[PDB]
PDB file of C-alpha atoms and ligand atoms in Angstrom:
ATOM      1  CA  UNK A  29     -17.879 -29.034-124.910  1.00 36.59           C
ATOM      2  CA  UNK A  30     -17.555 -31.385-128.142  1.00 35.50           C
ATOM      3  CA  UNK A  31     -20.261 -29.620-130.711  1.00 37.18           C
ATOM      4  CA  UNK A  32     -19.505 -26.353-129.230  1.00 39.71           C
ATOM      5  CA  UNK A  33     -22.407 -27.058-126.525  1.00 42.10           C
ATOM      6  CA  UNK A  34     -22.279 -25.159-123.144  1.00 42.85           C
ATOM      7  CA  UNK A  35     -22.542 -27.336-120.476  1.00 46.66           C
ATOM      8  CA  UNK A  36     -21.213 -25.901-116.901  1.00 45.49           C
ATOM      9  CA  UNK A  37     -21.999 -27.778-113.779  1.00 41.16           C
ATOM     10  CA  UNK A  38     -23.486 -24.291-111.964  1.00 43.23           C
ATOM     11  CA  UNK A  39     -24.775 -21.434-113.436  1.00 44.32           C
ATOM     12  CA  UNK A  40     -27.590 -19.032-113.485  1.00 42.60           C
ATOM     13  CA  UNK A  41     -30.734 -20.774-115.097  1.00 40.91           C
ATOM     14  CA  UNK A  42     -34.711 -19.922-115.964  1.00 41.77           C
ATOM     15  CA  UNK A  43     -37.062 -22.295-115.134  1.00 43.71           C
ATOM     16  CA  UNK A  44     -40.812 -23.085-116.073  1.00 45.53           C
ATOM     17  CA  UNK A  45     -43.073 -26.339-115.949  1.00 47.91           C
ATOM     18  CA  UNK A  46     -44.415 -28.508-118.642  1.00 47.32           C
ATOM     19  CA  UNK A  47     -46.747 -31.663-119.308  1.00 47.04           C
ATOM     20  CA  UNK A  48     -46.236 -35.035-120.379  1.00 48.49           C
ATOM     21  CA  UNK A  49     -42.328 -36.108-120.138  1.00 50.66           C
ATOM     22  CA  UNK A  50     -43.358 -39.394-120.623  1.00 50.79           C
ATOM     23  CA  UNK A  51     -41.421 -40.100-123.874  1.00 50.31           C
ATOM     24  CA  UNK A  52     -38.488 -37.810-123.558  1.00 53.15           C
ATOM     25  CA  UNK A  53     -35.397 -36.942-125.762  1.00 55.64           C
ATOM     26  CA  UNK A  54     -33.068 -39.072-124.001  1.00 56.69           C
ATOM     27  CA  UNK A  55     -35.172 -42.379-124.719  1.00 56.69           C
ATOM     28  CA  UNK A  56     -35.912 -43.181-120.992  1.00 58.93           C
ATOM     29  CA  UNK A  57     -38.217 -41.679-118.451  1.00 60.68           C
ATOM     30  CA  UNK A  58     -37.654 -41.995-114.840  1.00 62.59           C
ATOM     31  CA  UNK A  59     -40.469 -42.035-111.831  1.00 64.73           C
ATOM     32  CA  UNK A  60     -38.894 -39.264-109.813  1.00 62.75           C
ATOM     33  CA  UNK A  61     -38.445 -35.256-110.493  1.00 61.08           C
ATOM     34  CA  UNK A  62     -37.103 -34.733-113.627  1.00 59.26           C
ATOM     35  CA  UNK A  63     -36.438 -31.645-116.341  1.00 59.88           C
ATOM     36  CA  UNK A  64     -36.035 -30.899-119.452  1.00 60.09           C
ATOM     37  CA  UNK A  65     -32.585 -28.667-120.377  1.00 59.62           C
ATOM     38  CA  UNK A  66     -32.291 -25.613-123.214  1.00 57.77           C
ATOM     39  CA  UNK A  67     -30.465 -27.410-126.333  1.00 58.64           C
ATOM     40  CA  UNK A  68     -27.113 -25.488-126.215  1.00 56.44           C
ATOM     41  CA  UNK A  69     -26.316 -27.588-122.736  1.00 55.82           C
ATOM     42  CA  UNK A  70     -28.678 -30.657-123.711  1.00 55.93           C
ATOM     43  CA  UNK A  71     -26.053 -31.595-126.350  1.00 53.74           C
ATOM     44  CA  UNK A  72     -28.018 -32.880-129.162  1.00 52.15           C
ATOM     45  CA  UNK A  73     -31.032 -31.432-132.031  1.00 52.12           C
ATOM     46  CA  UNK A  74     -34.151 -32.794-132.257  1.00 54.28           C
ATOM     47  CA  UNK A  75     -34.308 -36.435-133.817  1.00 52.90           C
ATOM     48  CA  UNK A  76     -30.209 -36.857-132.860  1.00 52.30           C
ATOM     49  CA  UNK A  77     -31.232 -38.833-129.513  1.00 53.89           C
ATOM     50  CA  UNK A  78     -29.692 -38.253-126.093  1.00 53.41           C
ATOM     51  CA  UNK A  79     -26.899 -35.457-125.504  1.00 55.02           C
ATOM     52  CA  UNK A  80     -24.688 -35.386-122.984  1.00 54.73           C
ATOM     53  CA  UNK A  81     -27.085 -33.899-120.107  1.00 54.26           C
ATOM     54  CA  UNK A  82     -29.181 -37.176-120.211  1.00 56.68           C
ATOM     55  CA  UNK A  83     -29.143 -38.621-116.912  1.00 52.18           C
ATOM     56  CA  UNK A  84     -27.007 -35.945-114.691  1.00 57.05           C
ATOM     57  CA  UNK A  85     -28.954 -34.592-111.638  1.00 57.16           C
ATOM     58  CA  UNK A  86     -28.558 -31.155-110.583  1.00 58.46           C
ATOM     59  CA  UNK A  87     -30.052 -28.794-108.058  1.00 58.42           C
ATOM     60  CA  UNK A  88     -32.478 -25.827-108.696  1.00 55.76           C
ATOM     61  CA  UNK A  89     -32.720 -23.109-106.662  1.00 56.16           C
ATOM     62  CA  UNK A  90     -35.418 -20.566-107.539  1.00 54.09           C
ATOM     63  CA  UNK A  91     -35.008 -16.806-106.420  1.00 56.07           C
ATOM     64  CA  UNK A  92     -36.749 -14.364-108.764  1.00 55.31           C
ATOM     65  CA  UNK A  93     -40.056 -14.104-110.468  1.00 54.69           C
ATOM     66  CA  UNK A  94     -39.135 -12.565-114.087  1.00 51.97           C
ATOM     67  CA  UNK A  95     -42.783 -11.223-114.528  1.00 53.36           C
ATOM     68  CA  UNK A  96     -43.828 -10.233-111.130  1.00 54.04           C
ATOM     69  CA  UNK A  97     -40.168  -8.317-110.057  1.00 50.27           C
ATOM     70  CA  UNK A  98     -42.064  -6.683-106.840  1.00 48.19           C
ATOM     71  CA  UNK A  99     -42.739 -10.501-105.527  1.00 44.34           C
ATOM     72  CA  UNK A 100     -40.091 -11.028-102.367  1.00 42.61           C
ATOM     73  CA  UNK A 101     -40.837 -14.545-101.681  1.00 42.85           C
ATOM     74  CA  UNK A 102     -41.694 -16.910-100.741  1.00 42.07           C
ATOM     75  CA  UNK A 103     -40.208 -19.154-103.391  1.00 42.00           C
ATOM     76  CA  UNK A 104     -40.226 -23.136-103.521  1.00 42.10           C
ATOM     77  CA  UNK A 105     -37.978 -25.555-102.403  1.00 42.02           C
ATOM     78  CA  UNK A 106     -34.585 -26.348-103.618  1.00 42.48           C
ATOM     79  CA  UNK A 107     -35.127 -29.803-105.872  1.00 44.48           C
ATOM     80  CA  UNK A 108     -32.888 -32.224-107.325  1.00 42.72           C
ATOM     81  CA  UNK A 109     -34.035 -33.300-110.546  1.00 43.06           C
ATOM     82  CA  UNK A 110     -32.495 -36.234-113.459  1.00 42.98           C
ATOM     83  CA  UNK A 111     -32.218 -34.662-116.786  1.00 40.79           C
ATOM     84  CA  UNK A 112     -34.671 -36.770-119.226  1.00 40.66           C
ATOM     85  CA  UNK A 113     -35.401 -34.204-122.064  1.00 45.12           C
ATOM     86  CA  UNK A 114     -34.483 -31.337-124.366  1.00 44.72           C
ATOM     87  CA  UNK A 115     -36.319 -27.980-124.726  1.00 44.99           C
ATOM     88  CA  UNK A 116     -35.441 -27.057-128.077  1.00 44.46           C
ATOM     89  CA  UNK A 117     -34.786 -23.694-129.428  1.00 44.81           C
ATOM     90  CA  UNK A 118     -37.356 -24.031-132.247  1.00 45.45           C
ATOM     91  CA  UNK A 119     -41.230 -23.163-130.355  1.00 45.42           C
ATOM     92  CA  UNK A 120     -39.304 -22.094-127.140  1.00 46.66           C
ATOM     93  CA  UNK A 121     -37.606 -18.760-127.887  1.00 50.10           C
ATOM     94  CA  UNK A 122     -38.101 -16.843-124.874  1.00 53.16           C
ATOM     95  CA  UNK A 123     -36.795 -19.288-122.467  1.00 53.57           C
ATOM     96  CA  UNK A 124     -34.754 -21.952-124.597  1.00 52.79           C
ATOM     97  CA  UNK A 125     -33.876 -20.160-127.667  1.00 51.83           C
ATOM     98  CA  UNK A 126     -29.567 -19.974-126.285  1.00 53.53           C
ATOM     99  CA  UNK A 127     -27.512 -20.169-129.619  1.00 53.61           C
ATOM    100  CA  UNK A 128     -23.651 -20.071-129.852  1.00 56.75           C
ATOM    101  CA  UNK A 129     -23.818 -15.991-130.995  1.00 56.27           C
ATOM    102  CA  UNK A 130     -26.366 -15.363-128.650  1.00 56.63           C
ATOM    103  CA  UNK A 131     -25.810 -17.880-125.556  1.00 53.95           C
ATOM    104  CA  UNK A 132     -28.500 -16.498-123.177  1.00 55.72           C
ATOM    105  CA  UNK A 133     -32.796 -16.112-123.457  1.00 55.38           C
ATOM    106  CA  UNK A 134     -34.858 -13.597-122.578  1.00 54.38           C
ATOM    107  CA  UNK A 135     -34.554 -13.273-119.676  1.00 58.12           C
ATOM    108  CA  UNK A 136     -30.875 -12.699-119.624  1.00 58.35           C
ATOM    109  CA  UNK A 137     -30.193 -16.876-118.452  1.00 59.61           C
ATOM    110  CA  UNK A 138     -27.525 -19.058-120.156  1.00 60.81           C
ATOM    111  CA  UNK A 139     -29.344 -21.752-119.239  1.00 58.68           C
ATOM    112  CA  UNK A 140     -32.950 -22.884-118.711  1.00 58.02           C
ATOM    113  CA  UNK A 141     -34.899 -26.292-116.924  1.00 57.22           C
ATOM    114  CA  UNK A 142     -38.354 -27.049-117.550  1.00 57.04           C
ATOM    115  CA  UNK A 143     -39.317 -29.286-114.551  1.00 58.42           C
ATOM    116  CA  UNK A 144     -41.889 -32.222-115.571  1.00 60.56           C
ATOM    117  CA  UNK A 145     -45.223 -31.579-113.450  1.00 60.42           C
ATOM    118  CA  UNK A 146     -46.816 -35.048-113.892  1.00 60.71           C
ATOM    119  CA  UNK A 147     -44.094 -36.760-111.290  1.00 55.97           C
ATOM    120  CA  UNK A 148     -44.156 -33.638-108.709  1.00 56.30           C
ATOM    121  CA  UNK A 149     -41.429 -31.573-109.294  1.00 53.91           C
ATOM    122  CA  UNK A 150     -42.828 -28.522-110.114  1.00 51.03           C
ATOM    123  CA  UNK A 151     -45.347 -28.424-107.162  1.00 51.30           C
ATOM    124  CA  UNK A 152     -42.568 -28.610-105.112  1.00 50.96           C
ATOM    125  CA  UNK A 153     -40.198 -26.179-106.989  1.00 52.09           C
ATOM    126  CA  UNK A 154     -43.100 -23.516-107.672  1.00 48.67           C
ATOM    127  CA  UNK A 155     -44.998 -21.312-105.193  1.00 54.40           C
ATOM    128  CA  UNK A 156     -48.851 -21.401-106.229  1.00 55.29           C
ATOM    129  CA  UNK A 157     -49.581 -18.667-108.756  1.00 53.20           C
ATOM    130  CA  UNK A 158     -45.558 -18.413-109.833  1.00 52.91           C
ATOM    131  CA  UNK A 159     -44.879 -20.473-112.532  1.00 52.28           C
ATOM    132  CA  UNK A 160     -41.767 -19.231-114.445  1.00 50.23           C
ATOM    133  CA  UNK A 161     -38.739 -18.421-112.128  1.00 48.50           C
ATOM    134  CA  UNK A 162     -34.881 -17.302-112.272  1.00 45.21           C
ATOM    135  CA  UNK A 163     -32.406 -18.353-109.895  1.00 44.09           C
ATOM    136  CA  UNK A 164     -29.703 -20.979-110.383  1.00 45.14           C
ATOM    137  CA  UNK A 165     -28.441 -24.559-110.254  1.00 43.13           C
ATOM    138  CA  UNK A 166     -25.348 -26.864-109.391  1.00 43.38           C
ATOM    139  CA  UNK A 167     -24.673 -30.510-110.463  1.00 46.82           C
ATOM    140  CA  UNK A 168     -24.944 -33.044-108.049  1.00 50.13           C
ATOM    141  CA  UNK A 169     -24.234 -36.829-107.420  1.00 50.97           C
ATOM    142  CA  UNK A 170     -27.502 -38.365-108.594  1.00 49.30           C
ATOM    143  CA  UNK A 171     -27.197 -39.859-104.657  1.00 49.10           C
ATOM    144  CA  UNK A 172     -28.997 -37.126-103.979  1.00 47.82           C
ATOM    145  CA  UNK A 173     -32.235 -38.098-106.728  1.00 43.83           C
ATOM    146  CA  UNK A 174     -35.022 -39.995-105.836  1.00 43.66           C
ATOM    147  CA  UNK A 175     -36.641 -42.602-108.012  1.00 44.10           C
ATOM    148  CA  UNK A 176     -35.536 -44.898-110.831  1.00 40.67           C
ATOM    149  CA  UNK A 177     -35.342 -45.051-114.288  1.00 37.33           C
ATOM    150  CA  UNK A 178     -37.534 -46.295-116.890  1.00 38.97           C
ATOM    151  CA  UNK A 179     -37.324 -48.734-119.765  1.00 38.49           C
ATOM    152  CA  UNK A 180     -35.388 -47.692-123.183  1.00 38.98           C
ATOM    153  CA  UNK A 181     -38.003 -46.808-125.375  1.00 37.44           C
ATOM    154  CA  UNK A 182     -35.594 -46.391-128.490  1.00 33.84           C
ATOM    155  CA  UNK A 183     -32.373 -48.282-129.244  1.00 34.04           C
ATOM    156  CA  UNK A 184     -29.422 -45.541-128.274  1.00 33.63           C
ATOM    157  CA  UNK A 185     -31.710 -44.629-125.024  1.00 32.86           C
ATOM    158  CA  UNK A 186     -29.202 -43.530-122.231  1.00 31.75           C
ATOM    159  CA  UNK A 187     -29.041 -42.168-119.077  1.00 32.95           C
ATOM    160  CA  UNK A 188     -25.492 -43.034-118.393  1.00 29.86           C
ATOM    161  CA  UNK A 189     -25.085 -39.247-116.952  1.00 28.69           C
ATOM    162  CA  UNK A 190     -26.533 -40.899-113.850  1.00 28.61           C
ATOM    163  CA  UNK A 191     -23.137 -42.124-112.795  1.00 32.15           C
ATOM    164  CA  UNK A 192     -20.983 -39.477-114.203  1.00 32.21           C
ATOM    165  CA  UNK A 193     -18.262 -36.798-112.688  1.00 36.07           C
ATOM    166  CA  UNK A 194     -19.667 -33.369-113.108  1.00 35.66           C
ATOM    167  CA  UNK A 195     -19.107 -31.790-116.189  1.00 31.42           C
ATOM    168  CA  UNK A 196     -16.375 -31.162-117.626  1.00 34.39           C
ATOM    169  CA  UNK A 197     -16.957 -35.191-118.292  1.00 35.22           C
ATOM    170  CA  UNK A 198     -18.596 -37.398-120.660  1.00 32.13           C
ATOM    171  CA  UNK A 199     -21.475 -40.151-120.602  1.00 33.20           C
ATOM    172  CA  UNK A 200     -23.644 -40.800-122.974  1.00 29.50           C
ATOM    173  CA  UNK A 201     -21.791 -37.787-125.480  1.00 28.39           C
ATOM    174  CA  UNK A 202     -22.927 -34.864-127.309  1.00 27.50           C
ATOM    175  CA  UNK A 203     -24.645 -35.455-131.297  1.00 28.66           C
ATOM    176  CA  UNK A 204     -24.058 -32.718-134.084  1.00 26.99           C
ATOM    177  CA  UNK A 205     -22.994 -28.908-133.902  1.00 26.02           C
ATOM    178  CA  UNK A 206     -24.867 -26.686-130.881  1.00 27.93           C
ATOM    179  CA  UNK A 207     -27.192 -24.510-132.587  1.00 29.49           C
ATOM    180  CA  UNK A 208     -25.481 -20.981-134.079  1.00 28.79           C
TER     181      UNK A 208
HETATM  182  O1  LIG B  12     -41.103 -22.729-123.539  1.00 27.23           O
HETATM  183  C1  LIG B  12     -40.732 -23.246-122.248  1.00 27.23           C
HETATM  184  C2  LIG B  12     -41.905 -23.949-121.570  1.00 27.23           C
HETATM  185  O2  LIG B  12     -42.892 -22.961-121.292  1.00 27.23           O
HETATM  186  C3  LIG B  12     -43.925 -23.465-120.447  1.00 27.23           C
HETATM  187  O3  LIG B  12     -44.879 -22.452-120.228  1.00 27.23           O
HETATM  188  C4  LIG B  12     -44.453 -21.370-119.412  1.00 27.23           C
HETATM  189  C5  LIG B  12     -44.417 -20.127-120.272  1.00 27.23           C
HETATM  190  O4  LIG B  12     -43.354 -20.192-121.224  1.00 27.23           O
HETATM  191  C6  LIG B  12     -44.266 -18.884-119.409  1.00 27.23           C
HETATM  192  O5  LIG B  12     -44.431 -17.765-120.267  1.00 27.23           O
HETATM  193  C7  LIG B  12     -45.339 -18.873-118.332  1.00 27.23           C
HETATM  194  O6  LIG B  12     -45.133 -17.766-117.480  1.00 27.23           O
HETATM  195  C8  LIG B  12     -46.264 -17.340-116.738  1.00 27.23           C
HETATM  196  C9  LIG B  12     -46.052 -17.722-115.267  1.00 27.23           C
HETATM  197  O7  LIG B  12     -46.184 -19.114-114.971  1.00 27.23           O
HETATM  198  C10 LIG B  12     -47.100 -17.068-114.390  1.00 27.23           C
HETATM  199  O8  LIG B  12     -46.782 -17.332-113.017  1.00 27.23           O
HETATM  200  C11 LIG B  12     -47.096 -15.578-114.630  1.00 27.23           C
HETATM  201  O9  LIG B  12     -48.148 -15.041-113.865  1.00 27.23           O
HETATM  202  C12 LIG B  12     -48.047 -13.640-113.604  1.00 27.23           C
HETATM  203  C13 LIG B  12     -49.201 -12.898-114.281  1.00 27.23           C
HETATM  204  O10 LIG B  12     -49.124 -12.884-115.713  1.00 27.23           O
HETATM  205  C14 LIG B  12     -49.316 -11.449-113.809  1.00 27.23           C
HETATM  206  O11 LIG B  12     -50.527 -10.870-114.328  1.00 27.23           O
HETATM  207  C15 LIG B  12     -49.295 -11.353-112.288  1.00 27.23           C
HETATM  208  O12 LIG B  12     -49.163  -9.974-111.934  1.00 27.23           O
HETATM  209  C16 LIG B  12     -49.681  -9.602-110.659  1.00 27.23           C
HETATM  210  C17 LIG B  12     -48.526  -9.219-109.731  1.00 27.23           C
HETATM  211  O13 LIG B  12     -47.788 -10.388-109.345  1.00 27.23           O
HETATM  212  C18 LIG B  12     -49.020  -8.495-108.475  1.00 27.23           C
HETATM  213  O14 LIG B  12     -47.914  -7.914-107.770  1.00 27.23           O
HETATM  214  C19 LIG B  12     -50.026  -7.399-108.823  1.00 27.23           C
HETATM  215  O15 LIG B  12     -50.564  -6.852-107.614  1.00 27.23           O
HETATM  216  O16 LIG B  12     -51.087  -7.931-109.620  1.00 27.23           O
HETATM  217  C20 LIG B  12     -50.630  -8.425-110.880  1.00 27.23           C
HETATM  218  C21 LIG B  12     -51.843  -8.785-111.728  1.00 27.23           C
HETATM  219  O17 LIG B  12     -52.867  -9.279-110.865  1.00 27.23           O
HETATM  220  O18 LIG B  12     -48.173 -12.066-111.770  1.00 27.23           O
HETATM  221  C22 LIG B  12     -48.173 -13.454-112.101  1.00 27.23           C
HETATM  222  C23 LIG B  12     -47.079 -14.151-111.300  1.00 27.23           C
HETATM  223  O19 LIG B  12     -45.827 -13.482-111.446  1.00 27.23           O
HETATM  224  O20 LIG B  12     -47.396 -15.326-115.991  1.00 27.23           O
HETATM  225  C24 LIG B  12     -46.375 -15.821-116.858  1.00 27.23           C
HETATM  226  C25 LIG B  12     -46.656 -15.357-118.284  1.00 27.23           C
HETATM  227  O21 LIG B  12     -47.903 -15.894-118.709  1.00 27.23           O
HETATM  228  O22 LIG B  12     -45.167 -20.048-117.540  1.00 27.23           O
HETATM  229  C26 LIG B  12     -45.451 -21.225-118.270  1.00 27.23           C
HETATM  230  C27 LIG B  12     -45.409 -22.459-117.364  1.00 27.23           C
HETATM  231  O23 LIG B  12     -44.124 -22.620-116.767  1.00 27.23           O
HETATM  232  C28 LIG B  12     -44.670 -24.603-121.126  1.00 27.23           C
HETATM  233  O24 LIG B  12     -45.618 -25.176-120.209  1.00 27.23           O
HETATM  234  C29 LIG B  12     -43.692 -25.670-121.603  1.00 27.23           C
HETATM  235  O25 LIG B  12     -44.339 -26.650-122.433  1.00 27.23           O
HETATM  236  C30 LIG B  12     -42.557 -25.039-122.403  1.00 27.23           C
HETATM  237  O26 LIG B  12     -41.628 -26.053-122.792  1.00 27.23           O
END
């Protein structure tokens, strides 16, 4: 995509849980599931405001526990989540570290979501005691999201991803050069 960002609408993906997605990178929160995407698809550094993943909803499907590779099942739930926020490649190497020379993490995944546990997506995503996953994803119509947005926190804010084609497509538009 513009910048040289990788942004597919299915694909193999990581996944993990974080805290407090309150005031994420794409300057508006929203009350239902939501994630956080690895830079290289997110479509923006940060400080640059919202990328081009702000807003789109996709599906997560979790089939593989990296660290426990004996572990059969069972897994979660399939979610659908809004993208809100970035994981950036600096402090996140192992899971969000994709660059353009080396486009996938640790783990061997192009890309990576880091579900937001304070509005419930992660217990529903995550079986108790397995709380970093591999499996994959798919874009969806955000019919298929719960919830609604939140205020603009920042002037440039946007979730205009909500109402977007699948990628290949544009909304709110990709800021800078993907990460090398
Ligand atoms: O940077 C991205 C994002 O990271 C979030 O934090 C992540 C973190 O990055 C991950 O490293 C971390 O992963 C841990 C898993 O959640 C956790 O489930 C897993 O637990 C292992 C455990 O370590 C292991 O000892 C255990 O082994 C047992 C076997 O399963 C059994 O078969 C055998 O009989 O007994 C052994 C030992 O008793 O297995 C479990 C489960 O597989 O450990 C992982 C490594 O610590 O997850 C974090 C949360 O998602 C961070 O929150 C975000 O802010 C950040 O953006």
């Amino acid at each position: 995509a513009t910048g040289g960002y990788v942004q597919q609408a299915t694909g193999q993906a990581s996944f993990t849980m974080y805290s407090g997605c309150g005031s994420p990178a794409c300057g508006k929160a929203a009350s239902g599931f939501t994630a956080a995407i690895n830079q290289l698809a997110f479509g923006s550094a940060p400080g640059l405001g919202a990328g081009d993943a702000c807003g789109r909803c996709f599906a997560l499907t979790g089939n593989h526990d990296p660290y426990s590779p004996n572990y059969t099942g069972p897994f979660g739930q399939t979610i659908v989540v809004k993208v809100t926020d970035l994981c950036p490649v600096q402090g996140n190497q192992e899971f969000c570290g994709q660059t353009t020379s080396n486009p996938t993490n640790q783990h061997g995944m192009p890309f990576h979501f880091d579900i937001c546990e304070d509005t419930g997506g992660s217990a529903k995503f995550f079986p108790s005691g397995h709380g970093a996953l591999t499996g994959t994803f798919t874009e969806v119509s955000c019919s298929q999201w719960s919830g609604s947005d939140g205020g603009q926190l920042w002037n440039g804010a946007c979730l205009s991803g909500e109402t977007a084609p699948n990628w290949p497509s544009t909304a709110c538009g990709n800021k800078g050069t993907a990460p090398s």
